[PDB]
Ligand SMILES: N[C@H](Cc1ccc(I)cc1)C(=O)O
Ligand SMILES: [Ca+2]
């Protein structure tokens with residue numbers, strides 16, 4: 001897999017931050033900052049050669065969107081998906097939650113094109129709408145995915161909050177092959193990981209219908225323990241993300257090392273699991 005350039009990931013976050021500032025301070029469902037986020041991500045993918053689909057839904061009386069990006073080629077009967085919700089709460093720009101996962105998934109998708117990669121499995125990336133309303137976009141996607149296509153899914157990889165400023169390194173303990181792939185990457189860095197327990201994100205609708213899932217998380221409102229600070233640094237007794245769902249979830253609310261490591265791990269897993 002290629003090494004995902006941290007600066008490119010950060011640049012997507014800068015664009016999402018400006019989009020929020022230009023649209024009332026947020027990127028929330030039903031508000032113009034969300035569709036503008038979709039338009040940014042979609043244009044990058046279209047230019048890179050993806051076949052993109054805007055999947056529209058209505059929730060709360062307002063139109064929502066998922067952005068689906070299929071990399072042409074690969075076995076139609078073995079589809080590997082990776083995704084991240086692209087909406088924020090309305091209090092702020094949602095840069096860690098979840099610009100971080102959105103940007104890492106986008107830069108991984110662009111990296112496939114830059115590398116000239118032809119995965120054996122068909123790759124499909126997703127940016128979900130309305131996660132903050134209760135997983136509404138990912139539920140809509142799974143609910144509208146015919147059973148014959150659901151059975152073609154080899155896995156769904158989720159990235160929701162992966163740049164927390166006081167990070168832990170949590171790996172979902174779901175499908176064993178996907179979990180092993182992420183843990184192996186972190187082992188190569190000599191960075192310990194722990195099982196995610198802090199769940200409720202967009203892998204749940206996939207998990208609940210039997211699709212193998214996994215993912216990465218760096219912590220939210222829970223406090224980092226003394227033992228977690230000893231293994232990962234940062235500040236014991238402070239939240240992993242002190243700006244969770246806040247107006248201060250801005251460009252300053254990112255740990256660059258965690259963002260880099262989790263972006264690189266995302267690419268490692270997508271390459272490994274698609275051969
Ligand atoms: N508000 C949730 C926080 C959250 C993220 C990831 C997991 I796994 C569990 C919880 C979000 O949108 O990121
Ligand atoms: Ca990197």
Ligand SMILES: [Zn+2]
Pocket residue numbers: 085097098131160161201
């Ligand atoms: Zn989130």
Ligand SMILES: [Zn+2]
Pocket residue numbers: 089097132245
């Ligand atoms: Zn959230």
